[PDB]
C-alpha cells in the first residue's frame, strides 16, 4: 500500500489527466494503463489468453455499459436461443454469432468495422484458438479487444466420455460481470507488462490509485498462482500512461 501513500502517484495522475484536456492529440485517449518493469523475464509465452485481475474495492465497468460480442461453437442455435429468452441474459450481448458464420460474413474491411463497433469480445473457450485467424491481426495486437474466454455451463469433461452441451444463462452472466468489473492482463516473456487501471472522467484519482495497488498485490502474491503471482523478483519501476501519452513514473526502486 506504499504506492498509494506516496504523493508521486497522485501528482503524476493529476498531470496526466490535466494534459488530456489541454492536448488535442490525446482527446480520444480515455483509458489509463500502468506499465510494469518486472525485474526478470517472466518466461511465459504470450498465449493471447487474458488473465483477470480481481479489483475488490471498485468496479471498472458493468455489463450494460459495453458493446459485447459472443462467439459460440457451431451450431449457435442452442446458445443463442437460451441466452436471448432468459431474462438475465436477454440484453447482455450486442450480437451472438458462430465461428463459421463470423468467418463467412466478415472478411477484409468488414473486420475493421467489427472492431470499431464492439467494446468487449467474449467467446466460448473451445473456439478461442480459432479466433486469431478469423478476427485478423487488428484484434490480436495491442491488447485493447482481445477475446475473453467464458464457459457456457458448469459441466466438466472426463476422459473417454462426451461433453453434455448445456447453456446456463446465470453462469454466463456471472462470468461476464467479473470480466468487465475486474481488469485483466496478458503475460509476455520480458520485463514489460501493461494493465488497465482506470477510465478518464469515470474514476477519481484516489479510485485509480486503489486499483493500482490491487493489481500490484495480485500480480506479486505467489499464493494467487497461476493467475496471479507472475511478477517474481519485485518491480524495478511502475509508470502510468494513456494510449498515446508518454509514460509518467509513479514508483521506482
Amino acid at each position: 500500500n506504499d504506492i498509494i501513500k506516496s504523493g508521486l502517484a497522485e501528482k503524476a495522475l493529476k498531470a496526466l489527466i490535466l494534459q488530456c484536456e489541454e492536448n488535442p492529440s490525446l482527446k480520444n485517449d480515455k483509458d489509463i494503463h500502468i506499465i510494469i518493469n518486472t525485474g526478470k523475464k517472466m518466461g511465459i509465452n504470450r498465449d493471447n489468453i487474458p488473465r483477470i485481475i480481481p479489483l475488490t474495492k471498485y468496479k471498472l465497468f458493468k455489463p450494460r455499459d459495453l458493446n459485447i460480442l459472443l462467439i459460440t461453437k457451431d451450431p449457435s442455435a442452442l446458445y443463442r436461443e437460451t441466452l436471448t429468452k432468459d431474462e438475465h441474459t436477454s440484453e447482455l450481448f450486442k450480437e451472438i454469432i458462430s465461428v463459421k458464420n463470423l468467418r463467412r460474413r466478415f472478411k477484409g474491411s468488414k473486420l475493421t468495422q467489427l472492431y470499431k463497433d464492439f467494446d468487449l469480445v467474449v467467446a466460448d473457450y473451445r473456439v478461442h484458438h480459432l479466433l486469431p485467424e478469423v478476427l485478423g491481426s487488428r484484434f490480436y495486437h495491442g491488447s485493447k479487444k482481445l477475446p475473453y474466454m467464458i464457459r457456457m455451463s458448469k459441466e466438466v469433461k472426463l476422459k473417454r466420455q462426451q461433453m453434455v452441451e448445456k447453456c446456463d444463462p446465470i453462469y454466463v452472466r456471472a462470468q461476464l460481470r467479473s470480466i468487465c468489473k475486474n481488469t485483466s492482463y496478458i503475460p509476455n516473456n520480458d520485463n514489460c507488462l501493461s494493465v488497465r487501471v482506470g477510465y478518464i472522467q469515470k474514476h477519481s484519482i484516489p479510485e485509480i490509485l486503489q486499483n493500482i495497488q490491487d493489481t500490484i498485490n495480485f500480480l506479486t502474491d505467489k499464493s494467487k498462482r497461476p493467475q496471479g503471482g507472475v511478477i517474481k523478483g519485485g518491480i524495478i519501476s511502475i509508470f502510468v500512461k494513456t494510449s498515446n501519452s508518454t509514460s509518467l513514473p509513479i514508483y521506482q526502486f
Partner: peptide
C-alpha cells in the same frame, strides 16, 4: 476446473463470486 484438451482454460478463467451471482 481443468479441461485436458485446452490447458489455457485453467489460467484466464473468470472468477465468480457471491456478489456477482446476486441479481441487481
Amino acid at each position: 476446473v481443468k479441461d485436458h484438451r485446452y490447458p489455457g482454460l485453467t489460467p484466464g478463467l473468470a472468477p465468480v463470486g457471491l456478489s456477482d451471482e446476486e441479481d441487481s
